[PDB]
Design an enzyme around this catalytic site. Structure first.
Site, short mmCIF file in Angstrom:
data_model
loop_
_atom_site.label_atom_id
_atom_site.label_comp_id
_atom_site.label_asym_id
_atom_site.label_seq_id
_atom_site.Cartn_x
_atom_site.Cartn_y
_atom_site.Cartn_z
N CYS A 111 0.82 -1.06 0.03
CA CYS A 111 0.37 0.03 0.50
C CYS A 111 0.63 1.18 -0.01
O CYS A 111 1.65 1.27 1.03
CB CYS A 111 -1.10 0.01 1.24
SG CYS A 111 -2.19 1.61 1.40
N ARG A 114 -0.10 4.39 3.27
CA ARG A 114 0.45 4.36 4.08
C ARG A 114 0.70 5.67 5.09
O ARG A 114 0.75 5.10 6.43
CB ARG A 114 0.76 2.77 4.64
CG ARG A 114 0.53 1.95 4.71
CD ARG A 114 1.65 0.69 5.03
NE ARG A 114 2.67 1.00 3.72
CZ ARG A 114 4.03 -0.12 3.84
NH1 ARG A 114 3.88 -0.44 4.89
NH2 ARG A 114 4.31 0.23 2.55
N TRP A 283 -9.25 5.95 -0.70
CA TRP A 283 -9.87 6.96 -1.48
C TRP A 283 -8.63 6.38 -2.88
O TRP A 283 -7.47 6.09 -2.43
CB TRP A 283 -9.70 8.72 -1.30
CG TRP A 283 -8.03 9.19 -0.88
CD1 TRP A 283 -7.02 8.96 -1.35
CD2 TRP A 283 -8.03 8.80 0.91
NE1 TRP A 283 -6.20 9.71 -0.43
CE2 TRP A 283 -7.14 10.14 0.62
CE3 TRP A 283 -8.90 9.29 1.91
CZ2 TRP A 283 -6.47 10.21 1.49
CZ3 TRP A 283 -8.22 9.78 2.87
CH2 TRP A 283 -6.91 10.14 3.30
N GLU A 288 -5.11 4.15 -10.51
CA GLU A 288 -6.01 2.93 -10.60
C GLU A 288 -7.09 3.24 -11.89
O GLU A 288 -7.34 1.55 -12.19
CB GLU A 288 -6.37 3.00 -9.27
CG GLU A 288 -5.34 2.73 -8.15
CD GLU A 288 -6.10 2.24 -6.75
OE1 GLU A 288 -6.53 1.50 -6.35
OE2 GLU A 288 -6.46 3.59 -5.56
C1 HEM Z 1 -6.97 6.51 2.23
C2 HEM Z 1 -6.10 6.46 0.64
C3 HEM Z 1 -5.13 5.09 0.73
C4 HEM Z 1 -4.19 5.09 -0.55
C5 HEM Z 1 -4.40 6.01 -1.53
C6 HEM Z 1 -4.36 3.91 -1.41
C7 HEM Z 1 -3.05 3.42 -2.02
C8 HEM Z 1 -2.85 1.93 -2.04
C9 HEM Z 1 -2.54 1.39 -4.08
C10 HEM Z 1 -2.67 2.85 -5.19
C11 HEM Z 1 -2.82 0.63 -4.21
C12 HEM Z 1 -2.43 -0.76 -5.16
C13 HEM Z 1 -3.93 -1.49 -4.52
C14 HEM Z 1 -3.91 -2.12 -6.45
O1 HEM Z 1 -2.97 -1.66 -7.99
O2 HEM Z 1 -4.65 -2.82 -6.59
C15 HEM Z 1 -3.17 -0.17 -1.90
C16 HEM Z 1 -3.33 -1.23 -2.39
C17 HEM Z 1 -3.55 -1.46 -0.49
N1 HEM Z 1 -3.67 -0.92 0.62
FE1 HEM Z 1 -3.96 1.18 0.42
N2 HEM Z 1 -4.51 3.47 -0.53
C18 HEM Z 1 -5.49 3.53 0.65
C19 HEM Z 1 -6.17 2.91 2.12
C20 HEM Z 1 -5.66 1.37 2.90
C21 HEM Z 1 -6.36 1.42 3.88
C22 HEM Z 1 -8.03 2.22 4.63
C23 HEM Z 1 -6.95 0.14 3.72
C24 HEM Z 1 -6.86 -0.96 4.54
C25 HEM Z 1 -6.62 -0.43 6.13
C26 HEM Z 1 -5.68 -0.37 2.34
C27 HEM Z 1 -4.53 -1.58 2.83
C28 HEM Z 1 -4.55 -1.44 1.69
C29 HEM Z 1 -3.50 -3.55 1.26
C30 HEM Z 1 -4.27 -4.41 2.22
C31 HEM Z 1 -3.44 -3.16 -0.27
C32 HEM Z 1 -3.07 -4.37 -1.21
C33 HEM Z 1 -4.13 -4.84 -1.90
C34 HEM Z 1 -3.86 -6.00 -2.74
O3 HEM Z 1 -2.48 -6.98 -2.13
O4 HEM Z 1 -4.47 -6.46 -3.54
N3 HEM Z 1 -5.27 1.08 1.90
N4 HEM Z 1 -3.50 0.72 -1.66
N1 LIG Z 2 -6.93 3.65 -3.17
C1 LIG Z 2 -7.34 1.83 -3.14
C2 LIG Z 2 -6.86 2.06 -2.07
C3 LIG Z 2 -7.06 0.41 -0.88
C4 LIG Z 2 -6.64 -0.87 -1.67
C5 LIG Z 2 -6.72 -1.44 -1.82
C6 LIG Z 2 -6.44 -2.82 -2.55
C7 LIG Z 2 -6.54 -2.30 -3.88
C8 LIG Z 2 -6.90 -3.17 -5.30
N2 LIG Z 2 -5.91 -4.56 -4.96
C9 LIG Z 2 -6.92 -5.66 -5.94
C10 LIG Z 2 -5.58 -6.58 -6.70
C11 LIG Z 2 -6.77 -8.01 -6.40
C12 LIG Z 2 -6.25 -8.89 -7.31
C13 LIG Z 2 -5.99 -10.44 -7.07
N3 LIG Z 2 -4.86 -11.16 -7.78
C14 LIG Z 2 -4.66 -10.82 -8.81
C15 LIG Z 2 -5.37 -9.33 -9.55
F1 LIG Z 2 -5.48 -9.08 -10.84
C16 LIG Z 2 -6.10 -8.30 -9.03
C17 LIG Z 2 -6.90 -1.57 -4.36
C18 LIG Z 2 -6.86 -0.61 -3.53
N4 LIG Z 2 -7.24 0.82 -3.41
#
Ligand code: HEM
Ligand SMILES: Nc1ccc2ccc(CNCCCc3cncc(F)c3)cc2n1
Ligand code: HEM
Ligand SMILES: Nc1ccc2ccc(CNCCCc3cncc(F)c3)cc2n1
Ligand SMILES: C[C@H](O)[C@H](O)[C@H]1CNc2nc(N)[nH]c(=O)c2N1
Ligand SMILES: C[C@H](O)[C@H](O)[C@H]1CNc2nc(N)[nH]c(=O)c2N1
Ligand SMILES: [Zn+2]
Lengths: 413, 408
Positions: A111, A114, A283, A288
């Site tokens: 993420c 953070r 947000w 994305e």
């Molecule tokens: C507050 C604004 C936030 C922004 C700008 C942000 C930004 C991002 C971005 C750009 C990604 C890449 C996701 C992707 O490419 O699919 C990501 C992943 C992730 N975010 Fe954040 N995020 C935010 C909030 C949060 C919150 C509130 C949580 C959990 C409480 C969180 C937990 C995660 C996790 C666990 C991933 C990895 C997801 C995965 O492996 O599929 N994020 N975040």
């Molecule tokens: N702005 C944010 C904030 C938190 C987020 C947390 C998680 C995500 C989305 N992660 C989606 C990846 C799921 C995936 C799993 N396996 C294969 C894929 F192509 C895609 C987007 C977020 N965007």
């Protein structure tokens, strides 16, 4: 393992020292002979497996509140231990639940957002017993987090796993996503990413409008029961029409997106307890939507259409027509969100904030686990500071984890 | 076991068995990944390494355990036993060099791996010799714009005090100068090397794109300066096909990318001097050399000429300028008929290469962090390609800068 690992930033020369990696709790998937850093993804706990997991977390919590080794620390350890002994699980205090959720985010190596980890509204939904109740909790989450466009990060946490046959699950991958529809002719309408789930909803009784941006219903499972369908009140779903500041024609493409990214299929793990339903939301970073959702070949795939409207030479790849259109699309997404006053962050600001976040974490915490493959944005990589920043990736607990899709495992009643 | 890699766009799944061959470490452990870290002999050590390599050589020409194989093993063995080292046959040298390229996990250009002109320079004894060999290399590889991959290999290390080294990081590079006003003229990447050339007698023109002289060390002796004859230095004036003001930026670059500071290791033998060269992927110049903040850093100047609004980052003015700059680089090289590949074409070929390698070789070590281009990542196929990184020999390795180890 070596006690001090150094990371370097190659643009600023800044060297950071990581000690936090010693607290690493599970496997990355790499070995000494192979790195799996670009691999996407590299029956309950027994009483004996649970004991040290809970103690580790409790110690961590009481160390964080500067009460480590206190009477209250030892009493809590004692009470948890007895609970596990008599019931083979335990229940977190609200303080602990809030601490654990915030830390799972703080620990999410993938993420980039953070810097915000400590401002997370936690909704305790552990008293929920039915799917209608899950819907109520989810609606409240959506309304709070949306906040008329001034988005606020939040998580709603449903009861933890017991025997594994009574799981609470949100079947949706995000609370708000658009349907995809496979056509007899092989084409897809709407979002090709959501075809499988859309089909499931339709089988469960959903009547599809069969449009290009149809908000999917919630499919909600409580207590191991068969999942139920619910429509989110449309007034709770904030959406943004995509337009462009220079290209008057851009609005005629009829694109839009939803304001609230709300991931709902992950598993929250705290002190060995498993919260299989824990939808959270923050947000958007513009890319994305502007790069992945819109420009991925397996998604909305709009590059060609935009390029043709931009009158680009599309005969050679070396004209960079794809890159040129990609930038304009991303400009449009940021312009449209800012104009409707819906929170969004561009990939420059976000990566700059993350670098500062990372440096602070290294200073106060002894490190910051980070997945470079995920942290670097999907366009313009090297003109963002994270590109030049070495990162160490490792897994701390509490954490967010992937879990199998529920239709693959559900025992239909 | 067998490891599966998946492409998430095409859903193609490949199976890696080749990784079971690696014995060298990556740096990662079960608990910590160092995937984005830039940098994570004796007779007794020497023979098993020699034998390993001789074994795969004879396996590759499908004559394993043959009379030649047996004889070669004993021959090498005797030679190590009696001299603390051994000499590769020409065939082995070529095989070794092509395979070091093939095994380079960071290289997106590997579909070309078996097309490599190998120049054997192991008879070289002086910096003048090295210069002659390097000139011929550059002339051959440049080929009037129709670039040809090549490598020139100088004598292997012996005791560590008689190393051959090309002190330049690339054969052709632009100088960088620290100005009184604390700014930098030319390429800031080379400021240190430039100063060393100056201190050794090089008279700097003090311009923005001054081709550095060669600094060459033979047999552990002090390095010596040489000017590459200018007619051998192909350069491209960068212009834009739409913006006619772009040529007024006065930007240029050289056609031939020729990395000269790496170490080639083959069968336990270390070749500390092995300049090699191919041709450019456009982003190397247009994104990294020109737009890195610590390099030529031109984004702001260009953005101005495009009259973009540069007050807010969310206008993506930087991203806009970046694309136009990269369009110009490609157009210029193409217009001057100098070989260059765009990142779409290159990543495409790499995917096809991976497919080839999995089928015939059982895998392809690949570093996603390096393979994915520094712009427009996810609109290239490699972004969506899972890759496994692992270390196979023969290989190109990094080595310390000669100025930090050399005594005069
Ligand atoms: C507050 C604004 C936030 C922004 C700008 C942000 C930004 C991002 C971005 C750009 C990604 C890449 C996701 C992707 O490419 O699919 C990501 C992943 C992730 N975010 Fe954040 N995020 C935010 C909030 C949060 C919150 C509130 C949580 C959990 C409480 C969180 C937990 C995660 C996790 C666990 C991933 C990895 C997801 C995965 O492996 O599929 N994020 N975040
Ligand atoms: N702005 C944010 C904030 C938190 C987020 C947390 C998680 C995500 C989305 N992660 C989606 C990846 C799921 C995936 C799993 N396996 C294969 C894929 F192509 C895609 C987007 C977020 N965007
Ligand atoms: C023929 C056309 C070639 C193309 C288009 C190409 C492309 C590239 C690119 C773009 C990089 C990344 C460099 C950077 O970002 O600094 C790279 C890395 C690399 N290439 Fe290739 N290359 C070619 C030829 C070669 C040849 C002839 C060799 C050796 C015989 C080679 C060996 C390597 C190695 C060892 C790296 C890793 C560099 C490092 O770790 O610093 N490549 N290649
Ligand atoms: N077109 C080509 C072909 C082969 C190449 C082989 C190598 C290179 C350049 N590699 C640059 C690495 C320099 C470096 C290494 N570690 C840390 C740094 F800051 C800088 C470029 C190439 N370009
Ligand atoms: C194969 C590769 O790991 C995969 O395509 C990854 C690359 N990096 C990513 N980075 C982010 N933020 N999101 C993603 O979905 C991916 N996909
Ligand atoms: C910190 C990070 O490892 C470093 O910036 C890497 C990232 N990926 C790269 N990829 C390529 N092709 N070339 C590079 O110099 C780098 N630099
Ligand atoms: Zn790793």
């Amino acid at each position: 393992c070596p006690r001090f690992l150094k990371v370097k930033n190659w643009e600023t020369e800044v060297v950071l020292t990581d000690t936090l990696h010693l607290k690493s709790t599970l496997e990355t998937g790499c070995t000494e002979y192979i790195c799996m850093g670009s691999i996407m993804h590299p029956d309950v706990a027994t009483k004996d497996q649970l004991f040290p997991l809970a103690k580790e977390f409790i110690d961590q919590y009481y160390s964080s509140i500067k009460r480590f080794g206190s009477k209250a620390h030892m009493e809590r350890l004692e009470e948890v231990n007895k609970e596990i002994d008599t019931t083979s699980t335990y229940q977190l205090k609200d303080t602990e639940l809030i601490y654990g959720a915030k830390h799972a985010w703080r620990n999410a190596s993938r993420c980039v957002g953070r810097i915000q980890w400590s401002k997370l509204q936690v909704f305790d939904a552990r008293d929920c017993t039915t799917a209608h109740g899950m819907f109520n909790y989810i609606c409240n989450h959506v309304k709070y987090a949306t906040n008329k466009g001034n988005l606020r990060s939040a998580i709603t946490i449903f009861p933890q796993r017991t025997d594994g046959k009574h799981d609470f699950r949100v079947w949706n991958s995000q609370l708000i996503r658009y349907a995809g529809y496979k056509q007899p002719d092989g084409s897809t309408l709407g979002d090709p990413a959501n075809v499988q789930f859309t089909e499931i909803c339709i089988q469960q009784g959903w009547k599809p409008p069969r449009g290009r941006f149809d908000v999917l219903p919630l499919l909600l499972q409580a207590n191991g029961n068969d999942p139920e369908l619910f429509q989110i009140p449309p007034e709770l779903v904030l959406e943004v029409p995509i337009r462009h500041p220079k290209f008057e024609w851009f609005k005629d493409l009829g694109l839009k997106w939803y304001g609230l990214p709300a991931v709902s299929n992950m598993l929250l793990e705290i002190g060995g307890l498993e919260f299989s339903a824990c939808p959270f939301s923050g947000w958007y970073m513009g890319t994305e939507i502007g790069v992945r959702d819109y420009c991925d070949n397996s998604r909305y795939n709009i590059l060609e259409e935009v390029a043709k409207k931009m009158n680009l030479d599309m005969r050679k790849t070396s004209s960079l027509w794809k890159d040129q259109a990609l930038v304009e699309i991303n400009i449009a997404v940021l312009y449209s969100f800012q104009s409707d006053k819906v929170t969004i962050v561009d990939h420059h600001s976000a990566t700059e904030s993350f670098i500062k976040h990372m440096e602070n974490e290294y200073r106060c915490r002894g490190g910051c686990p980070a997945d470079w493959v995920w942290i670097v944005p999907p366009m313009s990589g090297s003109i963002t500071p994270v590109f030049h920043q070495e990162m160490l990736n490792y897994r701390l607990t509490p954490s967010f984890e992937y879990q199998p899709d529920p239709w693959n495992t559900h025992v239909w009643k």
